[PDB]
Amino acid sequence: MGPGFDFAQAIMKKNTVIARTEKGEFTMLGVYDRVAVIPTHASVGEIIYINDVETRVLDACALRDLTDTNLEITIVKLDRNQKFRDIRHFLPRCEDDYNDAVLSVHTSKFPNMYIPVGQVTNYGFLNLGGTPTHRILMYNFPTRAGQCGGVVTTTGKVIGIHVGGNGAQGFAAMLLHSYFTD
């Protein structure tokens, strides 16, 4: 409807796939080459379905900070025959707050879904499903089951992926440029 939704659509249309694990269907953001991200609670194993195609997982790393605290991001390298558009230049370098963000989801259950979530707070610490988690972004929108893995953007930046909520607020794990240096 406006430039926020324009940027989010541009990311969704080239840099997402539908990922299926034994724990469900997730929005999965492709970052560069065959490297993507997904919430750690998706429990990626040796095989994953990408757009309903059986795909070998070449590497999967559940990220933690240097305090050995969960970040809820798993970086996955896929045995796929095609590269993602490289979007690493849209990732922020540092932890921050944001205005006027969009949460965008694409699954079987929720295709072509875009939510204007508004102001994003650098929340920091969250006890997420009983697990101490750092680098959490918060927005005041009643997100639901089915939105995990959704991409959080502002105009010009890809800032996080949706990892939970409490019925009133939603929570995303930050994406930082430093996670994807090669």
Ligand X SMILES: C[C@@H]1CCO[C@@H]1C(=O)Nc1cnns1
User: Which residues contact ligand X (rule: CB under 6 A)?
Assistant: 143-145, 147-148, 164-165, 167, 170
Give the nearer residue to ligand X in terms of CB position, either 38 or 78.
38
CB of 56 to ligand X, least distance (A): 29
CB atoms within 10 A of CB 146: 18
Residues with active-site annotation: 41, 72, 148
Question: Minimal CA–CA distance to 110: which of 135, 140, 78, 143?
Answer: 143
Strands (E), 40-150: 47-50, 53-64, 70-78, 98-105, 113-128, 131-139
In the complex with ligand X, which residue's Cβ is closer, 78 or 102? 102
Q: Is the Cβ of residue 90 or residue 139 nearer to ligand X in the bound state?
A: 139
Q: Dihedral (C-alpha) 36, 180, 159, 127: value to the nearest 10 degrees?
A: 80
Q: What's the min distance (Å) between Cβ of 169 and ligand X?
A: 8
Q: Which residue is nearest to ligand X (CB)?
A: 165
| Nearer residue to ligand X within complex by CB, 66 or 168 | 168
Q: How far is the CB of 103 from ligand X (least distance, A)?
A: 10
Report, in Å, the least distance between residue 104 CB and ligand X: 14
Place of tokens 């994953």: 48
Distances (CA, A) of 61 to 17, 38, 58, 75, 180: 19, 10, 11, 5, 12
